[PDB]
Amino acid sequence: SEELLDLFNRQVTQEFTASQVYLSASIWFDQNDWEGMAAYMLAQSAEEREHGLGFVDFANKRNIPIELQAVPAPVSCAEWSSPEDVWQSILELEQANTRSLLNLAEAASTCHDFAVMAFLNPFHLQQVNEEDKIGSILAKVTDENRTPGLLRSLDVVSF
Amino acid sequence: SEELLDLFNRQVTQEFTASQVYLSASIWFDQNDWEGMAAYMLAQSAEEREHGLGFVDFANKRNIPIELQAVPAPVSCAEWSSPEDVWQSILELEQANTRSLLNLAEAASTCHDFAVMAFLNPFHLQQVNEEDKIGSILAKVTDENRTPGLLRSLDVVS
Amino acid sequence: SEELLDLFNRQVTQEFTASQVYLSASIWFDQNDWEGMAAYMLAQSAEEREHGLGFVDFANKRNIPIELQAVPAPVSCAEWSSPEDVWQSILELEQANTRSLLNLAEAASTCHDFAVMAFLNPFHLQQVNEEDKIGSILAKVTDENRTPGLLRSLDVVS
Amino acid sequence: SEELLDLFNRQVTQEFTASQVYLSASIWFDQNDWEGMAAYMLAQSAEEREHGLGFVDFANKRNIPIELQAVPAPVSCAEWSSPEDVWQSILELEQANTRSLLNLAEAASTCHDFAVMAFLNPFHLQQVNEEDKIGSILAKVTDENRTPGLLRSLDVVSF
Amino acid sequence: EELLDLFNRQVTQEFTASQVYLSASIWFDQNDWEGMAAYMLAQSAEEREHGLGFVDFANKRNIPIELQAVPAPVSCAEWSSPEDVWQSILELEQANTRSLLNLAEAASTCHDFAVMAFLNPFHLQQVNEEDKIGSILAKVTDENRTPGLLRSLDVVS
Amino acid sequence: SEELLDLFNRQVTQEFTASQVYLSASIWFDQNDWEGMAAYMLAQSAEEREHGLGFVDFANKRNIPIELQAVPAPVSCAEWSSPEDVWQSILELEQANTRSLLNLAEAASTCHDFAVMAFLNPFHLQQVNEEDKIGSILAKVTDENRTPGLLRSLDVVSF
Ligand SMILES: [Fe+3]
Ligand SMILES: [Fe+3]
Ligand SMILES: [Fe+3]
Ligand SMILES: [Fe+3]
Ligand SMILES: [Fe+3]
Ligand SMILES: [Fe+3]
Ligand SMILES: [Fe+3]
Ligand SMILES: [Fe+3]
Ligand SMILES: [Fe+3]
Ligand SMILES: [Fe+3]
Ligand SMILES: [Fe+3]
Ligand SMILES: [Fe+3]
Ligand SMILES: [Fe+3]
Ligand SMILES: [Fe+3]
Ligand SMILES: [Fe+3]
Ligand SMILES: [Fe+3]
Ligand SMILES: [Fe+3]
Ligand SMILES: [Fe+3]
Ligand SMILES: [Fe+3]
Ligand SMILES: [Fe+3]
Ligand SMILES: [Fe+3]
Ligand SMILES: [Fe+3]
Ligand SMILES: [Fe+3]
Ligand SMILES: [Fe+3]
């Protein structure tokens, strides 16, 4: 189960990578005066960190060694020029979180590690809800930004 | 020094000038049926007057003589044509409030006037917040006013 | 009527002028350690500004164009040398406020402007109350100040 | 740093010295039946002690060595004959507290000691207020004492 | 601009410190020091909040922020007792303090009164933090002179 | 009686001296990270100052003229090297406060000063309690310090 222990360790890196990418989106939104979208992103940055800390806590309890890796620099911000660019990157980010969790669950399954598979269940369900929510926001964003100025009313109203 | 006392007095005039220019903006907004923006400007007129009163109160305590100057007539209101023009003038007003506080702080720093520097700290931080907030409103106004009527939404909501 | 529009604008100037004169007074009092009288002047400074704002609000609703004028530098504080002098100048200030209101009401009457006359009624009555209160304070200040120190012992009616 | 550490110690001394001088003034007032002015001085004695204690606490946290110095016998009370003499000595005392703080800040500024400067900020503003208040009381006392017996009104009604 | 660079660097420093505290909580947990682990975990949260505060002020003040990589913590590999961990944490807070002071010096040279004012509560916070960490290190060092006695500090937390 | 006046004044000096010495103990404890013992000594510093204030207040009422003397610099902290040293010095301090109260009572008894004797009664009983309590803590400190680290473990708990 060297694969399982390694992937578990890497899941913590992935969640924290996502936290930093959300924070990067917050920053872009704030610098561009989308304070409502920036607040959503900031909240999600905290939530991803909490997912990471969940993995760490479970690993400690289950004697899965955790070695904390570099958290990479977010790079998508270099290329964002509209809110749609940001939300699309966040959709991609959540799809990558989901795939990383399914890979982990597959190694757990192969190992017959019932405890890990149980631990992961609510995370699988959470990612379903998160991808749906982000996809829905992206669809709204994309539609509203067909008329100049209109997407500014999503920011002020929702968020 | 002379410079320090002169600048402290002029800060009072600056806050009260800002108060009057905010009042002028509320009037333009009101006459043009932007009651939301008018109410915000009116609230800011009151706030700038409280900043001036703050400086007057400190000056009295610290024995800095205050002589109240004329508060000039607001000038920008004659040439405003849209809410974007108002908001841009208000941003510039806040930037001038900020520069004036920084010049005051400089003069206090030169005199080693630690009490004045301490008194000014929250005003420096308030200005950061105010410039950010006004700059953000201005960006929103500029963006929404690209579609006829849409800005009239900002007003009625927020 | 040009006369009624002009006078309505002048009333705003007069209220704000009064606001600054009261502030000047609070300053004189505070610098001379009359903290109770200073607080009273500060409160009256706020109240005059509220009158001005009420005029501006009504003008906006009634489509009377307001152009904000310079608010002049208070000058009586160069001559004040006792509390009596300050209160006397405050009395004369309120008498001028009352006169400008009466002149406005006169123009409104001439024009048969019933709404303006109704709007002014509470201000006419308020001026009765204010001239009465300030007059009574002045008489008390004048009487107490006939014994050294005695006036001080009643600013501590803070 | 020699001078900064010396001045920081001396500040504790100055606050406790002021505490003692205010106590002396409470004594003089009490003995002369100014119980209101006496209670005020006694409150100020406690307040100055609190300032000194705040300096001691900060010094402990910041590893600034404190050695407590003698608190000298107050000597102004030997010469006070009227309430006016006492309040003038108390004004001068506060003026000396203020000067001492400004000297300490100057030494902190020279050392680029940003933490000490920040700690001092509320003390700088407190001194403005105290000098103002003591200054105002002195003017009232000097005015009211121009009529025999009138100053006993300040004591009883106020205070 | 040395000031803009140093302001960016402060965000990185705080997040670095967040990770290092997380690494400490891990070492403590794995070695059954649950009380000390809880403390480090709370301090990890706190460092991240400091970093967030600098990002927020920078956004308001138009100081461009670009998030850097958060380096992996390195000290855990060599910790062998609680004393080692708390020593590393004291050092970490000393570095936090030094970086804040460097930032304040750059701000001072630029006459940037707003940045200097914003940093004031952080300078005071560092004083309290280095004091508290110092004091814990001292207790830990003392109590660990008797086999098993340090487990008492933990369980009374 | 000049002796009674002199002893009454010396009592004030002794209480204030005790206040400073307790403060010095708070500082040595704080510097050496004994925060609990430091808090205790700080509280006792305030209590001693209150005793002094109670003596000043009684003296003013009874027309016993008080002249504040110098409060000497505490010097025992230069030689304290363990908590036992500090607590031993505090026991000796309380024993000196008791002796000065007994000397004052003796002088009041000689003068048949019934009011001063009555005034002193609560302080005589308070000293019994204080010497008992300090003696008991000193015993505990002395015993616990026989095992490396054990004393620390109880600063943390007690106090
Ligand atoms: Fe923002
Ligand atoms: Fe959650
Ligand atoms: Fe996640
Ligand atoms: Fe997620
Ligand atoms: Fe309207
Ligand atoms: Fe302002
Ligand atoms: Fe402003
Ligand atoms: Fe005042
Ligand atoms: Fe009103
Ligand atoms: Fe009026
Ligand atoms: Fe009036
Ligand atoms: Fe008495
Ligand atoms: Fe206090
Ligand atoms: Fe206080
Ligand atoms: Fe003080
Ligand atoms: Fe003081
Ligand atoms: Fe555990
Ligand atoms: Fe930090
Ligand atoms: Fe920290
Ligand atoms: Fe401590
Ligand atoms: Fe007590
Ligand atoms: Fe007691
Ligand atoms: Fe005692
Ligand atoms: Fe005692």
Numbering used by the authors:
A (entry chain H), D (entry chain F), F (entry chain B): 1 to 159
B (entry chain A), C (entry chain E): 1 to 158
E (entry chain C): 2 to 158
What does the paper say about this structure?
Ferritin from the marine pennate diatom Pseudo-nitzschia multiseries (PmFTN) plays a key role in sustaining growth in iron-limited ocean environments. Typically formed from 24 subunits arranged as a symmetric, hollow sphere, ferritins take up soluble Fe2+ and catalyze its oxidation, with the resulting Fe3+ being stored as an oxy-hydroxide mineral in its central cavity. The di-iron catalytic ferroxidase center of PmFTN (sites A and B) has a nearby third iron site (site C) in an arrangement typically observed in prokaryotic ferritins. Here we demonstrate that Glu-44, a site C ligand, and Glu-130, a residue that bridges iron bound at sites B and C, limit the rate of post-oxidation reorganization of iron coordination and the rate at which Fe3+ exits the ferroxidase center for storage within the mineral core.
Three crystal structures were obtained from E44Q PmFTN crystals soaked for 5 min (E44Q Fe (5 min)), 45 min (E44Q Fe (45 min)), and overnight (E44Q Fe (o.n.)) in an aerobic Fe2+ solution. Iron was observed bound at sites A and B with near full occupancy, whereas site C was empty. Residue Glu-47 was part of site C in wild type PmFTN; however, in the E44Q variant structure, the side chain of this residue is instead pointing into the mineral core, and in five of eight subunits within the asymmetric unit, up to two iron ions are observed to be coordinated to Glu-47. These iron ions were modeled at 25–35% occupancy and occupy distinct sites from those observed in wild type PmFTN. In E44Q Fe (o.n.), an additional iron ion was modeled within some of the B-channels. The iron ion is close to the inner surface, coordinated by Glu-35, weakly coordinated by Asp-30, and coordinated by up to two solvent molecules, and modeled with occupancies of 25–35%. Glu-35 adopts two conformations, one coordinating to the iron ion and one pointing away from the channel. The E44Q Fe (o.n.) structure provides evidence that these channels can accommodate iron, coordinated toward the cavity end of the channel by Glu-35, Asp-30, and up to two water molecules. Interestingly, iron ions at the B-channels were not observed in the wild type protein or in any of the other variants, suggesting that binding of iron in the B-channels is enhanced in the E44Q variant. However, structural data suggest that there is no change of iron location, as Fe-A and Fe-B are fully occupied in E44Q PmFTN following overnight iron soak.
